[PDB]
């Protein structure tokens, strides 16, 4: 009925465990994410196996449902993908095809609409997190390049299933992928990205949605957010300096808390500096991620060191009048995954883990 715009966030100062979806304790999926419309949240995932291949699909269930075969809806063939709601209808994004000649497909509602072709003739990938719609214009991060080497990203502006504009970010673009994006304000989409080869510092994208321009710089903060990591504050040189332990990586969580006079930036990180174990929640209020070296504050442990952390993502729940920022965690077990959701709610400290 109406287009969605980002709204100010619901009051609160901390996160608490909200919900755990753990289908194996009673369909094998990976890289889950959550996307929400005005009155509906969906839990999306890619199938990994049956209850990069020709059989992987983008599937979903209502958030709160266990993602069984009977409950799941198969939206499209996809070894990589994302989804979002523009206030009127669901947009589903997926990538399929050959590693060196992959293609993006866009589905709107029930129909297939536009496609996008690989540009670096390497595995085309999308953000594996939900896409961001403002006024009907959905901004999707895509990337195409080497797993190890250069992989420049670009953004697609998608309107009613069609790709209307290609946005080519400037700045430090040598390797950007698996971006967790959200609105900082009505004018800006910010993303905390993976760098799978050069550094443990996440590229931080600032996309201007009034001008359709973007610039990427590494986060300057001493607390490094990727999985392989130097031991906090150990990377020397200016903010843009690449550090050690840059080979490999993980998609992290990232949400914004939009307050009338402030932007809170909530980030997630693993507990281990080398292995994908545990998850913690970190926060910084205000500042500029591209210049501010200040360590992120530690809010608390979301997943203990003894449990798998793996991928995380940001999403927001539409609470009638305000938005609720949430960070989800993909707990991979043996390789299906459980999804743990932590949401901003109330005040005080994060009190318990998953």
């Amino acid at each position, epitope marked *: 009925p109406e287009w969605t715009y980002p709204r100010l966030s619901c009051p609160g100062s901390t996160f608490q465990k909200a919900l755990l979806i753990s289908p194996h304790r009673f369909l094998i999926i990976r890289e889950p994410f959550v996307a929400c419309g005005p009155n509906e949240c969906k839990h999306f995932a890619l199938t990994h196996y049956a209850a990069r291949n020709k059989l992987r699909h983008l599937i979903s269930v209502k958030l709160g449902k266990i993602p069984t075969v009977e409950n799941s809806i198969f939206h499209m063939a996809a070894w990589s993908g994302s989804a979002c709601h523009d206030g009127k209808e669901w947009t589903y994004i997926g990538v399929d095809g050959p590693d060196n000649n992959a293609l993006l497909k866009v589905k709107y509602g029930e129909a297939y609409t536009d496609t996008y072709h690989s540009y670096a003739n390497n*595995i085309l990938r999308t953000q594996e997190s939900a896409c961001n719609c403002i006024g009907g214009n959905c901004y999707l991060m895509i990337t195409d390049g080497s797993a*190890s080497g250069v992989s420049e990203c670009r953004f697609l502006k998608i309107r009613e299933g069609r790709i209307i504009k290609e946005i080519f970010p400037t700045g430090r673009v040598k390797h950007t992928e698996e971006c967790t994006c959200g609105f900082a304000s009505n004018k800006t989409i910010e993303c905390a990205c993976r760098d*799978n*080869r050069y550094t443990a510092k996440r590229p931080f994208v600032k996309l201007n949605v009034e001008t359709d321009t973007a610039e990427i710089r590494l986060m300057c903060t001493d607390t490094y957010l990727d999985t392989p990591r130097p031991n906090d504050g150990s990377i020397t040189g200016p903010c843009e300096s690449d550090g050690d332990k840059g*080979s490999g990586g993980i998609k992290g969580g990232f949400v914004h808390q939009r307050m009338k006079s402030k932007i809170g930036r909530w980030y997630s990180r693993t507990m281990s500096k080398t*292995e*994908r174990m545990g998850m913690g929640l970190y926060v910084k209020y205000g500042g500029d991620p591209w210049a501010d070296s200040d360590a992120l504050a530690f809010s608390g442990v979301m997943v203990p060191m003894k449990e798998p952390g793996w991928y995380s993502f940001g999403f927001e729940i539409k609470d009638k009048k305000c938005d609720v920022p949430c960070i989800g965690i993909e707990m991979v077990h043996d390789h299906s995954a459980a999804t743990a959701i932590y949401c901003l709610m109330g005040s005080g400290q994060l009190l318990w883990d998953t």
Partner: antibody, heavy 126, light 107 residues
Framework: GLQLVQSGAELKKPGESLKISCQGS????????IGWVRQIPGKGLEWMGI????????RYSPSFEGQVTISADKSVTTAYLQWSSLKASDTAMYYC?????????????????????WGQGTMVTV | EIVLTQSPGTLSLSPGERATLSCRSS???????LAWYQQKRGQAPRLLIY???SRATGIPDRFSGSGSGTDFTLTISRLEPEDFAVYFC?????????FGGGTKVEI
């Protein structure tokens, strides 16, 4: 207490099959690659291949492709090197070694890592 | 595809002397991924250097090893009886790992 423990020694006849192994301890075995390295006593080291216990993803040096089999079983935290037709010339020391950093399938790259820990080596005659 | 020809192949330096060991690659070593290992008689080799010149944990400052392109060295700032071993160079990039013949360091 980080280690790779190998079997002691074997002596075989030409044509007699052979399996030797390494047991890992002190690390998260299913996320690190374990390689096999051959050393004929008067020669240098020769990378034979690597395995990723965890999904048993293997890579072989072209010169050992089809000559040996590399396998692993995360259940007992072990890695194996097998021959079907042990010829002679396999009179070498065989070592396991684990890569310095963990790897996950979604990294999508070939582990560009050195071998950080080595087993003591298994001596195989013939 | 990548061949490492480590040389001279034998050093005959006394303790207290600086030892330079070379490793010439037949083609450029991408990203500088050339490791060095120390093999003492009767035992599995120890990792000294990884990346073109990063020092492995537990390795003394005696071992440096700067290098780039196709031309890499291992430098032992001062030899000690402890470091008379056969040294090996290894390509450890995103391709089948491959070692050199090895250089023996004698008194």
């Amino acid at each position: 207490g980080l280690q790779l423990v190998q079997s002691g020694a074997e002596l075989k006849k030409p044509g007699e099959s052979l399996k030797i192994s390494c047991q890992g301890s002190g690390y998260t075995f299913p996320i690190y690659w374990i390689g096999w390295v051959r050393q004929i006593p008067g020669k240098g080291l020769e990378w034979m291949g690597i395995i990723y216990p965890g999904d048993s993803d293997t890579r072989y040096s072209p010169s050992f492709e089809g000559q040996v089999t590399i396998s692993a079983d995360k259940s007992v935290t072990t890695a194996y090197l097998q021959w079907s037709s042990l010829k002679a010339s396999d009179t070498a020391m065989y070592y396991c070694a684990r890569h310095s950093e963990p790897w996950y399938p979604d990294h999508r790259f070939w582990p560009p890592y050195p071998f950080d820990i080595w087993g003591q080596g298994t001596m195989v005659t013939v | 595809e990548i061949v490492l020809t480590q040389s001279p192949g034998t050093l005959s330096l006394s303790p207290g002397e600086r030892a330079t060991l070379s490793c010439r690659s037949s083609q450029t070593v991408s990203s500088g991924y050339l490791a060095w290992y120390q093999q003492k008689r009767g035992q599995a080799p120890r990792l000294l250097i990884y990346g073109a010149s990063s020092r492995a944990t537990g390795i003394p400052d005696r071992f440096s090893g700067s290098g780039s392109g196709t031309d890499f060295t291992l430098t032992i700032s001062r030899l000690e009886p402890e470091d008379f071993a056969v040294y090996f160079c290894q390509h450890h990039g995103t391709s089948p790992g491959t070692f050199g013949g090895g250089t023996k360091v004698e008194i």
